[PDB]
Amino acid sequence: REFDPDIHCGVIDLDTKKPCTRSLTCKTHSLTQRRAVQGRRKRFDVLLAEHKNKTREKE
Numbered sequence: 001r002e003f004d005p006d007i008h009c010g011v012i013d014l015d016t017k018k019p020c021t022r023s024l025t026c027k028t029h030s031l032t033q034r035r036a037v038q039g040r041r042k043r044f045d046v047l048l049a050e051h052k053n054k055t056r057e058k059e
């Protein structure tokens with residue numbers, strides 16, 4: 001709804017054409033694409049680590 005750079009993927013999604021507020025483990029975008037975007041207040045990986053601490057479910 002409200003793109004949250006602190007929490008979300010940040011990467012302007014070519015589907016939706018808005019930042020990527022899918023999730024922190026955004027299925028739309030590859031790892032590099034999440035990392036490339038400086039959306040979060042921390043690195044992507046470090047941020048995803050927090051995601052994994054919550055939603056530690058990865059495919």
Ligand SMILES: [Zn+2]
Binds near residue numbers: 009010022028
């Ligand atoms: Zn994304």
